[PDB]
Design a protein around this motif. Structure first.
Motif, PDB file in Angstrom:
ATOM      1  N   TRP A  46       0.843  -1.183   0.000  1.00  0.00           N
ATOM      2  CA  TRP A  46       0.000   0.000   0.000  1.00  0.00           C
ATOM      3  C   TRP A  46       0.886   1.244   0.000  1.00  0.00           C
ATOM      4  CZ3 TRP A  46      -4.574   0.726  -1.576  1.00  0.00           C
ATOM      5  CH2 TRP A  46      -5.178   1.973  -1.366  1.00  0.00           C
ATOM      6  N   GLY A  47       2.023   1.168   0.691  1.00  0.00           N
ATOM      7  CA  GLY A  47       2.914   2.307   0.727  1.00  0.00           C
ATOM      8  C   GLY A  47       3.392   2.712  -0.662  1.00  0.00           C
ATOM      9  N   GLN A  48       3.765   1.731  -1.468  1.00  0.00           N
ATOM     10  CA  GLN A  48       4.264   2.012  -2.840  1.00  0.00           C
ATOM     11  C   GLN A  48       3.144   2.585  -3.720  1.00  0.00           C
ATOM     12  OE1 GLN A  48       5.525  -1.424  -5.220  1.00  0.00           O
ATOM     13  NE2 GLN A  48       7.201  -0.169  -5.978  1.00  0.00           N
ATOM     14  N   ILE A  49       1.953   2.013  -3.505  1.00  0.00           N
ATOM     15  CA  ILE A  49       0.763   2.482  -4.238  1.00  0.00           C
ATOM     16  C   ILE A  49       0.500   3.976  -3.983  1.00  0.00           C
ATOM     17  CG2 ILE A  49      -1.767   2.495  -4.237  1.00  0.00           C
ATOM     18  CD1 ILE A  49      -0.877   0.278  -5.873  1.00  0.00           C
ATOM     19  N   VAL A  50       0.365   4.332  -2.706  1.00  0.00           N
ATOM     20  CA  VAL A  50       0.100   5.710  -2.304  1.00  0.00           C
ATOM     21  C   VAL A  50       1.211   6.589  -2.822  1.00  0.00           C
ATOM     22  CG1 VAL A  50       0.005   7.298  -0.357  1.00  0.00           C
ATOM     23  CG2 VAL A  50      -1.161   5.083  -0.237  1.00  0.00           C
ATOM     24  N   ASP A  51       2.434   6.084  -2.720  1.00  0.00           N
ATOM     25  CA  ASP A  51       3.627   6.797  -3.090  1.00  0.00           C
ATOM     26  C   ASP A  51       3.619   7.153  -4.561  1.00  0.00           C
ATOM     27  OD1 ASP A  51       6.603   6.511  -4.854  1.00  0.00           O
ATOM     28  OD2 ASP A  51       7.259   6.885  -2.787  1.00  0.00           O
ATOM     29  N   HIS A  52       3.222   6.190  -5.393  1.00  0.00           N
ATOM     30  CA  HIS A  52       3.130   6.423  -6.818  1.00  0.00           C
ATOM     31  C   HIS A  52       1.986   7.353  -7.182  1.00  0.00           C
ATOM     32  CE1 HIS A  52       5.703   2.693  -8.106  1.00  0.00           C
ATOM     33  NE2 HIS A  52       6.363   3.561  -7.357  1.00  0.00           N
ATOM     34  N   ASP A  53       0.932   7.453  -6.340  1.00  0.00           N
ATOM     35  CA  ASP A  53      -0.116   8.462  -6.549  1.00  0.00           C
ATOM     36  C   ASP A  53       0.442   9.879  -6.353  1.00  0.00           C
ATOM     37  OD1 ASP A  53      -2.537  10.097  -6.299  1.00  0.00           O
ATOM     38  OD2 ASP A  53      -3.602   8.259  -5.704  1.00  0.00           O
ATOM     39  N   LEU A  54       1.354  10.013  -5.391  1.00  0.00           N
ATOM     40  CA  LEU A  54       1.801  11.317  -4.935  1.00  0.00           C
ATOM     41  C   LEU A  54       2.936  11.919  -5.724  1.00  0.00           C
ATOM     42  CD1 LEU A  54       1.429  10.900  -1.092  1.00  0.00           C
ATOM     43  CD2 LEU A  54      -0.256  11.881  -2.700  1.00  0.00           C
ATOM     44  N   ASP A  55       3.942  11.148  -6.139  1.00  0.00           N
ATOM     45  CA  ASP A  55       5.135  11.742  -6.778  1.00  0.00           C
ATOM     46  C   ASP A  55       5.863  10.881  -7.776  1.00  0.00           C
ATOM     47  OD1 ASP A  55       5.448  11.179  -3.712  1.00  0.00           O
ATOM     48  OD2 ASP A  55       7.390  10.577  -4.518  1.00  0.00           O
ATOM     49  N   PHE A  56       6.444  11.524  -8.761  1.00  0.00           N
ATOM     50  CA  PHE A  56       7.258  10.870  -9.774  1.00  0.00           C
ATOM     51  C   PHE A  56       8.157  11.913 -10.426  1.00  0.00           C
ATOM     52  CE2 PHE A  56       7.492   8.441 -14.048  1.00  0.00           C
ATOM     53  CZ  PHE A  56       8.576   7.685 -13.605  1.00  0.00           C
ATOM     54  N   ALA A  57       9.455  11.754 -10.211  1.00  0.00           N
ATOM     55  CA  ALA A  57      10.467  12.648 -10.762  1.00  0.00           C
ATOM     56  C   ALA A  57      11.286  11.806 -11.734  1.00  0.00           C
ATOM     57  CB  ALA A  57      11.353  13.189  -9.643  1.00  0.00           C
ATOM     58  N   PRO A  58      10.741  11.571 -12.936  1.00  0.00           N
ATOM     59  CA  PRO A  58      11.433  10.768 -13.945  1.00  0.00           C
ATOM     60  C   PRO A  58      12.711  11.378 -14.526  1.00  0.00           C
ATOM     61  CG  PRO A  58       9.374  11.663 -14.845  1.00  0.00           C
ATOM     62  CD  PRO A  58       9.618  12.335 -13.511  1.00  0.00           C
ATOM     63  N   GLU A  59      13.599  10.504 -14.988  1.00  0.00           N
ATOM     64  CA  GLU A  59      14.862  10.910 -15.589  1.00  0.00           C
ATOM     65  C   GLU A  59      14.619  11.879 -16.738  1.00  0.00           C
ATOM     66  OE1 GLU A  59      16.545   7.186 -16.847  1.00  0.00           O
ATOM     67  OE2 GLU A  59      16.006   6.324 -14.898  1.00  0.00           O
ATOM     68  N   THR A  60      15.619  12.709 -17.019  1.00  0.00           N
ATOM     69  CA  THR A  60      15.544  13.679 -18.109  1.00  0.00           C
ATOM     70  C   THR A  60      15.607  12.917 -19.432  1.00  0.00           C
ATOM     71  OG1 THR A  60      17.964  13.901 -18.156  1.00  0.00           O
ATOM     72  CG2 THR A  60      16.755  15.471 -16.809  1.00  0.00           C
ATOM     73  N   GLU A  61      14.953  13.433 -20.465  1.00  0.00           N
ATOM     74  CA  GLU A  61      15.004  12.753 -21.747  1.00  0.00           C
ATOM     75  C   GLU A  61      15.544  13.586 -22.904  1.00  0.00           C
ATOM     76  OE1 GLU A  61      12.756   9.564 -22.233  1.00  0.00           O
ATOM     77  OE2 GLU A  61      12.653   9.490 -24.433  1.00  0.00           O
ATOM     78  N   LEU A  62      16.829  13.354 -23.094  1.00  0.00           N
ATOM     79  CA  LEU A  62      17.500  13.780 -24.319  1.00  0.00           C
ATOM     80  C   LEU A  62      18.088  12.518 -25.017  1.00  0.00           C
ATOM     81  CD1 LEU A  62      18.626  16.089 -26.306  1.00  0.00           C
ATOM     82  CD2 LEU A  62      20.494  16.417 -24.623  1.00  0.00           C
ATOM     83  N   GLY A  63      17.460  11.365 -24.745  1.00  0.00           N
ATOM     84  CA  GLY A  63      17.912  10.059 -25.253  1.00  0.00           C
ATOM     85  C   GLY A  63      16.936   9.274 -26.133  1.00  0.00           C
ATOM     86  N   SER A  64      16.323   9.965 -27.099  1.00  0.00           N
ATOM     87  CA  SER A  64      15.514   9.332 -28.161  1.00  0.00           C
ATOM     88  C   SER A  64      16.369   9.238 -29.428  1.00  0.00           C
ATOM     89  CB  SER A  64      14.246  10.150 -28.458  1.00  0.00           C
ATOM     90  OG  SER A  64      13.358  10.183 -27.348  1.00  0.00           O
ATOM     91  N   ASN A  65      16.833   7.974 -29.742  1.00  0.00           N
ATOM     92  CA  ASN A  65      17.712   7.735 -30.881  1.00  0.00           C
ATOM     93  C   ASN A  65      18.999   8.441 -30.474  1.00  0.00           C
ATOM     94  OD1 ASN A  65      19.090   8.546 -33.531  1.00  0.00           O
ATOM     95  ND2 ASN A  65      17.444   7.203 -34.264  1.00  0.00           N
ATOM     96  N   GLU A  66      19.634   7.905 -29.437  1.00  0.00           N
ATOM     97  CA  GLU A  66      20.841   8.501 -28.885  1.00  0.00           C
ATOM     98  C   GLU A  66      21.930   7.471 -28.575  1.00  0.00           C
ATOM     99  OE1 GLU A  66      20.425  11.862 -28.521  1.00  0.00           O
ATOM    100  OE2 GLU A  66      22.553  12.156 -28.033  1.00  0.00           O
ATOM    101  N   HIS A  67      23.151   7.967 -28.390  1.00  0.00           N
ATOM    102  CA  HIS A  67      24.305   7.135 -28.053  1.00  0.00           C
ATOM    103  C   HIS A  67      24.565   7.380 -26.574  1.00  0.00           C
ATOM    104  CE1 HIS A  67      25.623   6.268 -32.198  1.00  0.00           C
ATOM    105  NE2 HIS A  67      25.329   7.525 -32.482  1.00  0.00           N
ATOM    106  N   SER A  68      24.327   8.624 -26.167  1.00  0.00           N
ATOM    107  CA  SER A  68      24.537   9.070 -24.795  1.00  0.00           C
ATOM    108  C   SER A  68      23.836   8.171 -23.779  1.00  0.00           C
ATOM    109  CB  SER A  68      24.070  10.518 -24.636  1.00  0.00           C
ATOM    110  OG  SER A  68      24.746  11.148 -23.563  1.00  0.00           O
ATOM    111  N   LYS A  69      22.967   7.286 -24.255  1.00  0.00           N
ATOM    112  CA  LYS A  69      22.299   6.360 -23.353  1.00  0.00           C
ATOM    113  C   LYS A  69      23.357   5.325 -23.012  1.00  0.00           C
ATOM    114  CE  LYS A  69      19.458   5.177 -26.510  1.00  0.00           C
ATOM    115  NZ  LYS A  69      18.423   5.042 -27.570  1.00  0.00           N
TER     116      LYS A  69
END
Ligand code: HEM
Ligand SMILES: *[C@@H]1O[C@H](CO)[C@@H](O[C@@H]2O[C@H](CO)[C@@H](O[C@H]3O[C@H](CO)[C@@H](O)[C@H](O)[C@@H]3O)[C@H](O)[C@H]2NC(C)=O)[C@H](O)[C@H]1NC(C)=O
Ligand SMILES: *[C@@H]1O[C@H](CO)[C@@H](O[C@@H]2O[C@H](CO)[C@@H](O)[C@H](O)[C@H]2NC(C)=O)[C@H](O)[C@H]1NC(C)=O
Ligand SMILES: *[C@@H]1O[C@H](CO)[C@@H](O)[C@H](O)[C@H]1NC(C)=O
Ligand SMILES: *[C@@H]1O[C@H](CO)[C@@H](O)[C@H](O)[C@H]1NC(C)=O
Ligand SMILES: CC(=O)Nc1ccc(O)cc1
Ligand SMILES: [Ca+2]
Length: 595
Positions: free
Chosen positions: A103-126
């Motif tokens: 339940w903790g993870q569930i509530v947690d995912h309702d509240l916040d998400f700070a996803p990685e930056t995306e400059l990696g679509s068709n990239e090498h830097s990945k």
């Protein structure tokens, strides 16, 4: 000084005033300031950010630059010396079901998400970050220390990419870097319905006027629904077994498929919505689709709010519950309902509650099959174990009959997570969640352990002897001093989780305070809080008062034997009862006669 706002990302602001429903993005909740609590805005700062250069670089970036006169230890070393442990015996929480952790993870995912930056679509830097471990820009690799076993079988580092931040996405420098929260700060079931109109709509079954959420058309759980598949490549759920070839699920939240029990919980929620749309139809044949969707949405959001605040928080905070979350007084439009940056780290305490195994139980709550118990790492992004190996009932039984891992100062994070975590596009079950939490805390410019002790009105130890007294543990304090050389530098994630647990709760005093405030604020600052005057009718509110997680299971699985108090340790058959002796949700007060 402090000009009021960068606002290139969230531009559109149009609020229909009358509306009886929350928006998907969270906008318009607060009428005076409509963007407060909406997804895709910067996380709130309760205290000024602390960066090596005071602007964007994290501490631990430049070798020669110290924090308060000292080098910060590598995330992985702190992980190896304090977080790890070998013996999984006696680590279980004799008094918290595995549902507690989930339940903790569930509530947690309702509240916040700070996803990685995306400059990696068709990239090498990945791969430049993966292959050669070279720090630069958004690549901030977690290097292994001298005596690390992963050095021998995994290279020099563990890849890591800095979290997304507002106005730009590669360069910017005038004000301190603020990370983005991609979900709504309100406890609104955004994890079932989404936090974007694009996703919200896709998730809906718009083929019929029944206001239902789309379900899987290729697989059924003995009659009951499954979350639709996310037809997108490359899928990590297909990667972990290329034979089963089972995709990840599509939920209101991105992370739903990360581990099998979260996927399970997401499944129950999706079913409950639909069940709710069907009963509302019967009672109100005239209500159109939208109305059905929204009225079902609205009910599910209340459900999540009641279980979290009535059942969950009291057993997380224990004695501290009252000090921070006194009885509801009503909606206070002056309260900041945004999720703070630090909260997203403080809520990671749940990581020490994850056990090393997961089980499947049959109708008598006994081992389902010859491999009923599975190691936690074989279930990261595993949807086939549900689809091609028993639906979710066997897992929901495990969630009820099994125990969470009790946090323990000498046994913090199980190796299933600390050494065998799987990350999408990376190919090995060889990552470390503890190390990542630490690196992330620095990536977010988090203040040290003492700044937060000070923030919460607690003492700020400055010596070994100082820390021992607070942690009530000599050996842990010594290990931390040897690594940090000042309690001022201890990363808040580990410092907060090292404190002994408050009476009746499952976190220390620092975290109790941090979690306490946040939840008090998302409640008092929410215009659509279920118990807030005018949101529901007086009569609907007495009907809601009866929800139980038990009931949710009875209504949405083929289980008929459940405990009365889902979050406490429960054993079969003693602590179990028949679903019929369990309060249902009377929907009569939703009938609407206007003629
Ligand atoms: C087996 C269960 C779990 C797994 C495998 C897992 C894994 C992860 C991973 C990979 C991340 C992101 C790391 C990063 O990029 O910084 C994360 C973040 C997080 N986890 Fe867990 N986690 C689990 C359970 C939990 C639980 C039980 C809680 C709460 C009680 C929790 C709270 C959080 C929070 C708050 C974050 C930060 C989210 C944000 O970006 O805002 N997690 N978890
Ligand atoms: C990848 O997923 C595969 C597809 O499900 C899985 O194979 C399946 O799982 C086991 C492996 O042999 C078999 O189930 C076992 O139990 C049944 C009881 O009904 C019996 O037929 C046998 O004892 C059987 O071994 C499934 O039959 C099997 N199906 C297929 C088509 O192979 C793999 O094990 C998974 N591989 C990995 C690496 O996860
Ligand atoms: C959207 O809902 C419709 C209508 O309920 C679904 O179509 C039905 O699915 C049932 C199985 O429950 C089949 O027997 C019929 O083909 C349809 N029945 C009726 C009464 O319409 C449809 O599957 C849903 N679509 C999605 C993508 O979830
Ligand atoms: C277990 O926790 C509950 C709170 O969830 C509490 O009522 C009880 O005191 C605890 N029981 C035992 C046996 O320790
Ligand atoms: C409303 O919120 C503000 C800020 O948190 C607080 O100062 C004030 O006491 C609150 N009033 C009530 C009645 O809750
Ligand atoms: C699915 C995914 O991006 N990984 C993931 C991130 C955070 C979390 O709490 C669980 C899983
Ligand atoms: Ca939310």
């Amino acid at each position: 000084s402090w000009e009021v706002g960068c606002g290139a990302p969230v531009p559109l602001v149009k609020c229909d005033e009358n509306s009886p429903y929350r928006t998907i993005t969270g906008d318009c909740n607060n009428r005076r300031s409509p963007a407060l609590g909406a997804a895709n805005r910067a996380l709130a700062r309760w205290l000024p950010a602390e960066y090596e250069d005071g602007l964007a670089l994290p501490f631990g970036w430049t070798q020669r630059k110290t924090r308060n006169g000292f080098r910060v230890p590598l995330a992985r070393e702190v992980s190896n010396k304090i977080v790890g442990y070998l013996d999984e015996e006696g680590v279980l929480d004799q008094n918290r079901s595995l549902l507690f952790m989930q339940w903790g993870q569930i509530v947690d995912h309702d509240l916040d998400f700070a996803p990685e930056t995306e400059l990696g679509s068709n990239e090498h830097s990945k791969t430049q970050c993966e292959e050669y471990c070279i720090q630069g820009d958004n690549c901030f690799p977690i290097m292994f220390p001298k005596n690390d076993p992963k050095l021998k079988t995994q290279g020099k580092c563990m890849p890591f990419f800095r979290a997304g931040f507002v106005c730009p996405t590669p360069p910017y420098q005038s004000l301190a870097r603020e990370q983005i929260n991609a979900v709504t700060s309100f406890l609104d079931a955004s994890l079932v319905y989404g936090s974007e109109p694009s996703l919200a709509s896709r998730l809906r079954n718009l083929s019929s006027p029944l206001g239902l959420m789309a379900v899987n058309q290729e697989a059924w759980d003995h009659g009951l629904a499954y979350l639709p598949f996310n037809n997108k490549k490359p899928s990590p759920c297909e990667f972990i077994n290329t034979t089963a070839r089972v995709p990840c699920f599509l939920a209101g939240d991105f992370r739903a498929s990360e581990q099998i029990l979260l996927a399970t919980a997401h499944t129950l929620l999706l079913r409950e919505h639909n069940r709710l749309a069907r009963e509302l139809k019967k009672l109100n044949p005239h209500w159109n689709g939208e109305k059905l969707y929204q009225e079902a949405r609205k009910i599910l959001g209340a459900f999540i709010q009641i279980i979290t605040f009535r059942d969950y928080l009291p057993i997380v905070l224990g004695s501290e519950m009252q000090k921070w979350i006194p009885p509801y007084q009503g909606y206070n439009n002056s309260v900041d309902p945004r999720i703070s940056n630090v909260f997203t780290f403080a809520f990671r305490f749940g990581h020490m509650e994850v056990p090393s195994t997961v089980s499947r139980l049959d109708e008598n709550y006994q081992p389902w099959g010859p491999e009923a118990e599975l190691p936690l790492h074989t279930l990261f992004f595993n949807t086939w174990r549900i689809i091609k190996d028993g639906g979710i009932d066997p897992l929901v039984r495990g969630l009820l009959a099994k125990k969470s891992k009790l946090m323990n100062q000498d046994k913090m994070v199980t190796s299933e997570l600390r050494n065998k975590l799987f990350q999408p596009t990376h190919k090995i079950h060889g990552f470390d969640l503890a190390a990542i939490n630490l690196q992330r805390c620095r990536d977010h410019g988090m203040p040290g352990y003492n700044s937060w002790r000070g923030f919460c009105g607690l003492s700020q130890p400055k010596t070994l002897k100082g820390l021992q007294t607070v942690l009530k543990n000599k050996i842990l304090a010594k290990k931390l001093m040897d690594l940090y050389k000042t309690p001022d530098n201890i990363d808040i994630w580990i410092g907060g989780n090292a404190e002994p647990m408050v009476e009746r709760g499952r976190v220390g005093p620092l975290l109790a305070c941090l979690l306490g405030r946040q939840f008090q604020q998302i409640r008092d600052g929410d215009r659509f809080w279920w118990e807030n005057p005018g949101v529901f009718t007086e009569k609907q509110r007495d009907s809601l008062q009866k929800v139980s997680f038990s009931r949710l299971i009875c209504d949405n699985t083929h289980i008929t034997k459940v405990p009365l108090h889902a979050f406490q340790a429960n054993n079969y058959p003693h602590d179990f009862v028949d679903c019929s002796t369990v309060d249902k949700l009377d929907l009569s007060p939703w009938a609407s006669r206007e003629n």
